Nucleic acid binder design. Structure first.
Ligand code: QSI
Length: 529
RNA sequence: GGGGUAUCGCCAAGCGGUAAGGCACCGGAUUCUGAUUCCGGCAUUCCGAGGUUCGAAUCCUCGUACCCCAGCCA
């Protein structure tokens, strides 16, 4: 529960509302990130928990910054997280005629006028955080002039920035938002929904309070930065002819360590080509996390754990990872894969190989078992073999033994190096009947695999606070290794995850996984304390 | 100027009754994944200083730290 749900519990009792109607209003100017997910869970979640409704609305009031590819990807991420919206998808653009009419009502009430102060002059006239603003020389035009002038704007008779429609409120308000905020500005740009029918587009504050009201929204849930805007929201609805008046509630936005959480910065990583795309597995975007191996259920869990409050916060990466581990640890089938392979021959072994049985999930027999090929020439991880090694080292030591996962116990004996003195092959012997512990893969039946290890995109906890966050990108946020996996992964599918025993959770696709050379993304490593 | 928030390393309950939970962490027990699972520990303190009260983190007062607002962006 959170303060917002508590308010709603009250409202229901008193009877202010008998139904709750929320909305998720993203602007299609980029892809959604994990923060947007916190918002999606909140609005859609509250709706379903209270047998209510939640609209998916595209706040598409700025043509030049938006693209149809963004609206497309947003519907996708909302669906993927497991949420359904009310009726058809909505667009603010659906209300452009409506907004135009409401602007005309304000002008008629002398509550709005066409200003001709250039874009620079408006800031010069606006005042400062400590000094009040001053009325524009065009502030007292007659209703008739404003009316004619607005029509000229709409008709395209003014060059961009040469004119705008402003609300007539209070140039001396301590609330900068109330200093005659702009309602409309000129833009000769094609809109992804309205094409070229308009050359004037409504501003955010004007559009949003009216959109909510026409949609019957009961609880407009937004983030803390729109707190000051609150008085403009109510001003507009109080001054036009509209029957409902939605209530606002702000909660703090999500921040995750070692990453950025704004579309502007995420876009720069995309445009400057420092990540493959919005959906790069290293990105905090919904799509990137999906591609990374996270389950929607893991994300919904995360959002449930972090809560909804009014306090600034930065969650630690451990928390998000904990969520994905809790999921995959329970549902992901296990398999063998060697990321850093080194040949190990069993001079003692006789034949072309045999078959050994391995549980698909140890702690869960109900998940079944599989048949895995074993032989005398296998691959183990270079890190699991040491010639010396101290006491705690429970792996393979030149002279000691180690149990090969779900197989036989073997003893290291003769190693073999090359030029630089690197080991090329490890010879051992196996105990005919014997069935630390290391994983392995039979070299003859092994599937050549590309393994992509990922890590924090940035080297610092708060890359957003850097002068140049790009210069603080982590050069090892992605390292590609070529390894070997048990033949069983031959049928692996994109999306589905597996636990590479003693390594971590991995999954296919990665946009690169083909038929010949499979590519696996390490979703997250195993807890190694 | 105006608007917010300050409870254990990171999140977060508590709305006058004398400090939930999660993540992280530190111990021990299981375990053919040094995983998991499993028991145990972890703020006598709630930004600070006063005041009212039988009694406050929860009310009031003065402070202090931090966040947001001066786009014809959202
Ligand atoms: N009052 C409002 O709702 C304004 C919505 C505005 N068009 C907007 O913010 N669009 S947006 O596409 O940028 O984001 C859409 C919603 O996502 C929320 N949001 C954005 N970043 C968030 C974050 N880091 N954590 C939690 N929530 C976050 C916004 O509040 C908005 O409602």
């Amino acid at each position: 529960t959170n303060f917002i749900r508590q308010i709603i519990d009250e409202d229901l009792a008193s009877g202010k509302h008998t139904t709750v109607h929320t909305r998720f209003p993203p602007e299609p100017n980029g892809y959604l990130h994990i923060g947007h997910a916190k918002s999606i869970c909140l609005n859609f979640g509250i709706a379903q928990d209270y047998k209510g409704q939640c609209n998916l609305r595209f706040d598409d009031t700025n043509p030049v910054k938006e693209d149809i590819e963004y609206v497309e990807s947003i519907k996708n991420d909302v669906e993927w997280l497991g949420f359904h919206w009310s009726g058809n998808v909505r667009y603010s653009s659906d209300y452009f005629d409506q907004l135009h009419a409401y602007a005309i009502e304000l002008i008629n009430k002398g509550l709005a006028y066409v200003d001709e102060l250039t874009p620079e002059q408006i800031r010069e006239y606006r005042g400062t955080l400590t000094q009040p603003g001053k009325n524009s020389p065009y502030r007292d035009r007659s209703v008739e002039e404003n009316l004619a002038l607005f029509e000229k704007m709409r008709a395209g008779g003014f060059e961009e920035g040469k004119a705008c429609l402003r609300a007539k409120i209070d140039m001396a308000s301590p609330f900068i938002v109330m200093r005659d905020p702009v309602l409309y500005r000129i833009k000769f740009a094609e809109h992804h929904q309205t094409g070229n029918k308009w050359c004037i587009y409504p501003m955010y504050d004007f559009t949003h309070c009216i959109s909510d009201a026409l949609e019957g929204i009961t609880h407009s849930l937004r983030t803390l930065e729109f707190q000051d805007n609150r008085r403009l929201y109510d001003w507009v609805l109080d001054n036009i002819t509209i029957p409902v008046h939605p209530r606002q509630y702000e909660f703090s936005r999500l921040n995750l360590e070692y990453t950025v959480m704004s579309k502007r910065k995420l876009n720069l990583l995309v445009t400057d080509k420092h990540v493959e795309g919005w959906d790069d597995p290293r990105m905090p975007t919904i799509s990137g996390l999906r591609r990374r191996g996270y389950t929607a259920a893991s994300i919904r869990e995360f959002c449930k754990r972090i809560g909804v409050t009014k306090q600034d916060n930065t969650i630690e990466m451990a928390s998000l990872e904990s969520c994905i581990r809790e999921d995959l640890n329970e549902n992901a089938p296990r398999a063998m894969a060697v990321i850093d392979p080194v040949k190990l021959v069993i001079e003692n072994y006789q034949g072309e190989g045999e078959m050994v049985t391995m549980p698909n999930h140890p702690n869960k027999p109900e998940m079944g078992s599989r048949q895995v090929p074993f032989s005398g020439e296998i691959w183990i991880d270079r890190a699991d073999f040491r010639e010396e090694a101290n006491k705690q080292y429970k792996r393979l030591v030149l002279g000691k033994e180690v149990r090969l996962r779900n197989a036989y116990v073997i003893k290291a004996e003769r190693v073999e190096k090359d030029a630089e003195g690197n080991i090329t092959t490890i010879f051992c012997t196996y105990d005919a009947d014997t069935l630390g512990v290391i994983h392995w893969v039979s070299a003859a039946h092994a599937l050549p695999v590309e393994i992509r290890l990922y890590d924090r995109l940035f080297s610092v906890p708060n890359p957003g606070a850097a002068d140049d966050f790009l210069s603080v990108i982590n050069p090892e946020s992605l390292v590609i290794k070529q390894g070997f996996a048990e033949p069983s992964l031959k049928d692996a599918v994109a999306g589905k995850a597996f636990q590479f025993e003693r390594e971590g959770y991995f999954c296919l696709d990665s946009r690169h996984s083909t038929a010949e050379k499979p590519v696996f993304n390490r979703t997250v490593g195993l807890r190694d304390t």
